[PDB]
Design a protein around this ligand. Structure first.
Ligand code: A1EFQ
Length: 147
């Protein structure tokens, strides 16, 4: 019926159907459009206290909670989706990953290289598409597939 990971859902606040992807955590009102050996993605990472390494170039000791990190991710998504900000601008300013310095770009990668929730989300994204919050042992990610 729908592209990999995508399902129909029901809006509580509007009663209108929407689309949810249980691999990427994306959600949108519009029906999704229409697998490669490699994808290329950028990401914005927000780390927290349970991160595999609770440290980043932004913060020597990262002390926020999983919940606080998810709310930040939720605010970044709202700003990207509203057009108030662009993904790679926010990655450069606020990503807790060292790829912040390359506007969140991680380069191309195959299956078997990244942490799997990330790998799965990345490969279920089409070029140009963004994920919702993706949880890994590094923290919470927003993922943009670029190639
Ligand atoms: C802001 C940006 O480049 C984006 C986010 C989803 N797709 N493109």
């Amino acid at each position: 019926k729908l592209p990999p990971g995508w399902e129909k859902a029901m809006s509580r606040s509007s009663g209108r159907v929407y689309y949810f992807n249980h691999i990427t955590n994306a959600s949108q009102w519009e029906r999704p459009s229409g697998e490669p050996a490699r994808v290329r993605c950028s990401h914005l990472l927000v780390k927290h206290s349970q991160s595999r390494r609770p440290s980043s170039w932004r913060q020597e000791k990262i002390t926020r909670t999983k919940e606080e990190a998810l709310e930040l991710i939720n605010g970044y998504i709202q700003k990207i989706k509203s057009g108030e900000e662009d993904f790679e601008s926010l990655a450069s300013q606020f990503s807790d990953c060292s790829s912040a310095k390359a506007r969140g770009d991680l380069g191309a990668f195959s299956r078997g290289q990244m942490q799997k929730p990330f790998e799965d989300a990345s490969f279920a994204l089409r070029t140009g598409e963004m994920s919702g919050p993706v949880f890994t042992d590094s923290g919470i990610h927003i993922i943009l597939r670029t190639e």
